[PDB]
Amino acid sequence: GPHMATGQDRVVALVDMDCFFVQVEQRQNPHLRNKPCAVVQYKSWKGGGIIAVSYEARAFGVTRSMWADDAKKLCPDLLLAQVRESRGKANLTKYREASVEVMEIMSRFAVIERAAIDEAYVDLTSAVQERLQKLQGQPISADLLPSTYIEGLPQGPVQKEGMRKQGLFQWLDSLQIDNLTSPDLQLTVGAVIVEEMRAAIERETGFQCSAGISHNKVLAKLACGLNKPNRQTLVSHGSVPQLFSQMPIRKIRSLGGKLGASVIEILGIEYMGELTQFTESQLQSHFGEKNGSWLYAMCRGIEHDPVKPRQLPKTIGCSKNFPGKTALATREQVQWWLLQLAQELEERLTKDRNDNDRVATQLVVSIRVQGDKRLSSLRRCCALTRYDAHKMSHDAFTVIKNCNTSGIQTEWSPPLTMLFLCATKFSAS
DNA sequence: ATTTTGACGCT
DNA sequence: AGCGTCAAA
Ligand SMILES: [Ca+2]
Ligand SMILES: [Mg+2]
Ligand SMILES: [Mg+2]
Numbered sequence A: 001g002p003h004m005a006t007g008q009d010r011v012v013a014l015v016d017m018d019c020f021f022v023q024v025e026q027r028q029n030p031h032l033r034n035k036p037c038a039v040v041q042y043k044s045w046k047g048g049g050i051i052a053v054s055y056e057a058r059a060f061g062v063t064r065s066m067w068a069d070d071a072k073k074l075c076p077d078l079l080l081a082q083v084r085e086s087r088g089k090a091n092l093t094k095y096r097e098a099s100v101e102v103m104e105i106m107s108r109f110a111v112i113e114r115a116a117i118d119e120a121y122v123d124l125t126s127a128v129q130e131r132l133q134k135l136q137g138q139p140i141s142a143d144l145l146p147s148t149y150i151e152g153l154p155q156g157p158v159q160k161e162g163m164r165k166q167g168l169f170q171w172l173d174s175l176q177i178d179n180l181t182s183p184d185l186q187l188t189v190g191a192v193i194v195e196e197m198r199a200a201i202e203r204e205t206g207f208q209c210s211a212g213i214s215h216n217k218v219l220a221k222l223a224c225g226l227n228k229p230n231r232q233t234l235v236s237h238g239s240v241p242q243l244f245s246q247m248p249i250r251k252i253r254s255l256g257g258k259l260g261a262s263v264i265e266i267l268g269i270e271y272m273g274e275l276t277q278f279t280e281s282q283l284q285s286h287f288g289e290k291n292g293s294w295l296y297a298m299c300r301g302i303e304h305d306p307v308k309p310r311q312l313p314k315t316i317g318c319s320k321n322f323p324g325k326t327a328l329a330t331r332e333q334v335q336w337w338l339l340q341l342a343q344e345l346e347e348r349l350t351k352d353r354n355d356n357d358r359v360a361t362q363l364v365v366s367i368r369v370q371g372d373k374r375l376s377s378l379r380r381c382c383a384l385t386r387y388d389a390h391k392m393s394h395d396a397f398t399v400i401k402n403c404n405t406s407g408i409q410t411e412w413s414p415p416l417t418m419l420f421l422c423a424t425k426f427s428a429s
Numbered sequence B: 001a002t003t004t005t006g007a008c009g010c011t
Numbered sequence C: 001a002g003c004g005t006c007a008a009a
Helices: A020-028 A067-076 A093-107 A123-134 A158-175 A181-203 A217-227 A237-246 A258-267 A272-277 A281-288 A289-296 A331-356 A391-404
Strands: A012-018 A038-040 A048-051 A081-082 A113-115 A119-123 A147-151 A210-216 A232-234 A314-321 A329-331 A356-368 A378-381 A411-428
Touching: A012 A181, A012 A217, A020 A048, A020 A093, A020 A281, A038 A067, A048 A067, A067 A147, A067 A158, A067 A314, A067 A329, A081 A329, A093 A113, A093 A119, A093 A181, A113 A158, A119 A217, A119 A281, A147 A158, A181 A210, A181 A232, A217 A232, A232 A411, A258 A281, A272 A289, A281 A289, A329 A331, A331 A356, A331 A411, A356 A391, A378 A391
Parallel strands: A038 A081, A147 A232, A210 A232
Antiparallel strands: A012 A119, A012 A210, A038 A048, A113 A119, A314 A411, A329 A411, A356 A378, A356 A411
């Protein structure tokens, strides 16, 4: 009752760019705008692998991971943009730079946590308090929320936009605007701010995005996906029981893999809401102390993970796969590709040092051997003392050379299906 | 023969 | 330290 926390103490948003790499390419090439199109890496093998897909193309069934040749069977007029290739490998610089554009705009509004190349969490609690003081009891107009959905509404006693407006009207007609401590009002002001933030992103970059607004990161992330693209969704604390009552467990962030499968298998449930019937101790007994407490609160819509103040990635990495017959089988091959990776890494590190006043101090080398299901077969670290590609490639070879079983120095066995260099452990400079 | 990333947890 | 999990385009 009066002491039961309800996880309504924060306003958190998650902003996620729509079909991000596709929008980057469509901004650059107006011929691709408003078309079924996809972004592909490599072209020789089955037309290249698709990594991003416009919503027009998704209507034909085109998805990520599809070979372009196969996507063309579903969508013969599909347009394609290719990821840049440099030093023999795909190079994602254009998308990293577009990401910086968006992150820098979002940072003007509030502290953000960079969650991926195209998404960030936003802690809006303080901004909401400020805006509520500015508003001075003034009601919030639907015109301030032109792309907002209120999850769960409309309810009670045939076009999409019509439903959106009906739900928003019910919500705003039911708000108590004089209570500055009302969580629902705080979320609503949050959504007003997010409309402003999304408008700024689109104005200043050309890119559209979706967003979720709720009381914590997990619900904000879930909310964001409910009405893509180019829309935002408010998930209130009160919407949680109905929302979770038919929500597959795997849809909640962190439960899409083995742990989620085990929750389903061990407990014999399917939906997030069903978790409420277990005690905290029961959940801890199956999934561990940390996961158990997290599940117990999360299934009630409560999560405390903070929006971390971090706009920049903590690692800078470069990797290449060598699938099937292309696996690296000679020492020379391994050294040449380590050099290519190290040269890209050097370029990115030097730019990072100039832009962000920091230097990486550890180099992580990872390889995969043909026949291993795991992404990485072996990982070794060494000191990163100079931004020099020849030194980094030599040091990586030094730390992995003993993995070569082959009695012949010139041959590498078992062949390598992957090389990965990652700069970590940044210090101020 | 998706590939190329990035964060964080465990021991 | 080195390995595993989960998530992005
Ligand atoms: Ca996205
Ligand atoms: Mg994303
Ligand atoms: Mg996606």
